[PDB]
Write a protein that binds this ligand. Structure first.
Ligand SMILES: C[C@]12CCC(=O)C[C@@H]1CC[C@@H]1[C@@H]2CC[C@]2(C)[C@@H](O)CC[C@@H]12
Lengths: 8, 241
């Protein structure tokens, strides 16, 4: 996801 | 204590929406700028959360899950506080460049939701909530919504959330009514977030028809994570029944 890529 | 030191140190500063206050108030303009406020506040919520005491204890997917489920309540709570401390709850202080007056509460087609948020904000006044009680309450809202089937490492979550409750009771201290009252307030965030979830979801579904822009992370969260809440797979944790 855009969120998980950003988060990690 | 160390705990409060941290919450105050990591608290995010000012986030602007990038709203063009020259354009006339339209549903599409107001909603698009709120959507963009959300994406930018999402970044700060992420960095705040990673710096929270014990948070890195959670399995990484739990860390991300809990963020993607609770950002609405988190953000609504903080905006309630801003509204209270900036404009004494007369208006909804989404951002310094995005302040809702009644006309905008109307033009956004979210008026009843807005009334509820203003009511929340009013509460900070009515209850004489302190900055410290705010900060601790807000931390707890991050650990206030989980899948009904539990998390990847449920035990670490339970223990973290317990500790945050303990901290809120600590910075409280016939003192009994207080805690009743703060938990109650915390619960009241949940129905408001629920309505906004329902609202943003419907809005995204139809957004191409109404020329409302959803930025990228907002689009994906609202379509992937938010329906797990609306469908009942993920539910808030209520203090009171
Ligand atoms: C989180 C925001 C923006 C961040 C904030 O200060 C509270 C506020 C509450 C309503 C949300 C909005 C982000 C964009 C949303 C989700 C719109 O799509 C409909 C409801 C809006």
């Amino acid at each position: 996801s855009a969120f998980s890529r950003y988060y990690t | 204590p160390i705990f409060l030191n941290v919450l105050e140190a990591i608290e995010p500063g000012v986030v602007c929406a990038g709203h063009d206050n020259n354009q006339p108030d339209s549903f599409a303009a107001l909603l698009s700028s709120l959507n963009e406020l959300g994406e930018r506040q999402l970044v700060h919520v992420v960095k705040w959360a990673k710096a929270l005491p014990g948070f890195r204890n959670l399995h990484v997917d739990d860390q991300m899950a809990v963020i993607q489920y609770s950002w609405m309540g988190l953000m609504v709570f903080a905006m309630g506080w801003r509204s209270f401390t900036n404009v004494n709850s007369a208006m909804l202080y989404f951002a310094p460049d995005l302040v809702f007056n009644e006309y905008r509460m109307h033009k956004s087609r979210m008026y009843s939701q807005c009334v509820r948020m203003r009511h929340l904000s009013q509460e900070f006044g009515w209850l004489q909530i302190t900055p410290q009680e705010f900060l601790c309450m807000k931390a707890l809202l991050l650990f206030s919504i989980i899948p009904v089937d539990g998390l990847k490492n449920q035990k670490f979550f339970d223990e973290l959330r317990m500790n945050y409750i303990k901290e809120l009771d600590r910075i409280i201290a016939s003192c009994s009514r207080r805690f009743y009252q703060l938990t109650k307030l915390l619960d009241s965030v949940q129905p408001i977030a629920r309505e906004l979830h329902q609202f943003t979801f419907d809005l995204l579904i139809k957004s191409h028809m109404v020329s409302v822009d959803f930025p990228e992370m907002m689009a994906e969260i609202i379509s992937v994570q938010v329906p797990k809440i609306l469908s009942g797979k993920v539910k808030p944790i209520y203090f009171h029944t």
